[PDB]
Design a protein around this ligand. Structure first.
Ligand SMILES: CCCOCCn1c(=O)c(NCCN2CCOCC2)nc2ccc(-c3ccc(OC)nc3)nc21
Ligand SMILES: [Mg+2]
Ligand SMILES: [Mg+2]
Ligand SMILES: [Zn+2]
Length: 324
């Protein structure tokens, strides 16, 4: 819609202070879609990206709305609000968490774009579902990070779209580099890849060998940061985290519904509304096995990222209290 673009581009963008986007404890629940878009513009602006890379205001506005409209409204969790929340946690980590200081302008540009774009056109079903249902996507990408490849494809398609070319102001070297960072950052949101690569990260920190001047370590850090931001709802104040957890479960059970009907299987516990009683012990196991070490390691990298760790620990106890 042209009107929606014109509304957004003509709107005054409140300050980061007013929008509370620097807060790790930030919540989007009370915000309109328009307000989420204004927040996004402010993230680009206060990370000095609109200035640095000479972005036209209307081009940025169109791109944001194009990203937003390419998330599905019938997917409970992996929708625009999750993407938006991921981007906001990135902003918070960069600003209040002091990660900005450790990265180049290009890396920040690519990280912001990847956060917003990383679940584009998510269908509300997992990679394994797409593989099982012989979807053409799983065929294109050899059953490997299927959704994530698709998300990157969508990201590129929008970046290439007339009027949406927010990177048109980059030099060729910067453009190529930025696109590569974006691709690797979006792929990193496959939790399979996180598991595969996190040991190296944890051991670099343990041996005091962590050095962001190393290109390979930089890429590794960026992947870890993406996973951290992506999973950050789990670190939110209990009532916020609890509401988002309900959405996560809704999407998982919707998939299980599809699996019963389309595949005639009993879904795995994660996907099985009939076994919703497992949610709390499953949240505890997930926090222990996946989340805690990540937020610890990030705090090791920058002590100002502690609130994510604190939040995660507090929510673990709450879930454990329900489970035990
Ligand atoms: C909440 C439903 C039950 O979830 C159990 C936890 N939980 C899981 O038990 C799980 N299991 C499958 C992981 N594998 C597939 C990929 O390859 C490796 C293994 N995946 C999860 C993914 C996201 C969240 C999640 C995100 C945000 C949030 O914010 C509040 N809460 C949870 N919670 C998850
Ligand atoms: Mg994803
Ligand atoms: Mg150059
Ligand atoms: Zn995500």
């Amino acid at each position: 819609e042209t009107r929606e673009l014109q509304s957004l581009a003509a709107a005054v963008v409140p300050s980061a202070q007013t929008l509370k986007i620097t807060d790790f404890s930030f919540s989007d629940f009370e915000l309109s879609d328009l307000e989420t878009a204004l927040c996004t513009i402010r993230m680009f602006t206060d990370l000095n990206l609109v200035q640095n890379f000479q972005m036209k205001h209307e081009v940025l506005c169109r791109w944001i709305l194009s990203v937003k409209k390419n998330y599905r409204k019938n997917v409970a969790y992996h929708n625009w609000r999750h993407a938006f929340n991921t981007a906001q946690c990135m902003f918070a980590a960069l600003k209040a968490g002091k990660i900005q200081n450790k990265l180049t302008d290009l890396e920040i540009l690519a990280l912001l774009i990847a956060a917003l774009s990383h679940d584009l056109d998510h269908p509300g079903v997992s990679n394994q579902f797409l593989i099982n249902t012989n979807s053409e996507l799983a065929l294109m990408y050899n059953d490997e990070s299927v959704l994530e490849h698709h998300h990157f494809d969508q990201c590129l398609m929008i970046l290439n779209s007339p009027g949406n070319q927010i990177l048109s102001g980059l030099s060729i070297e910067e453009y190529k580099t930025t696109l590569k960072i974006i691709k690797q950052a979006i792929l990193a949101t496959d939790l399979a890849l996180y598991i595969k690569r996190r040991g190296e990260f944890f051991e670099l920190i343990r041996k005091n060998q962590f050095n962001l001047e190393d290109p390979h370590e930089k890429e590794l850090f960026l992947a870890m940061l993406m996973t951290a931001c992506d999973l950050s709802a789990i670190t939110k104040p209990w009532p916020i985290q609890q509401r988002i957890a309900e959405l996560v479960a809704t999407e998982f059970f919707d998939q299980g519904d599809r699996e019963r009907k389309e595949l005639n299987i009993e879904p795995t516990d994660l996907m099985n509304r009939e076994k919703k009683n497992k949610i709390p012990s499953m949240q505890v196991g997930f926090i222990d096995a996946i989340c805690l070490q990540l937020y610890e390691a990030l705090t090791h990298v920058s002590e100002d990222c502690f609130p994510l760790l604190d939040g995660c620990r507090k929510n673990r106890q709450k879930w454990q209290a329900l489970a035990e």
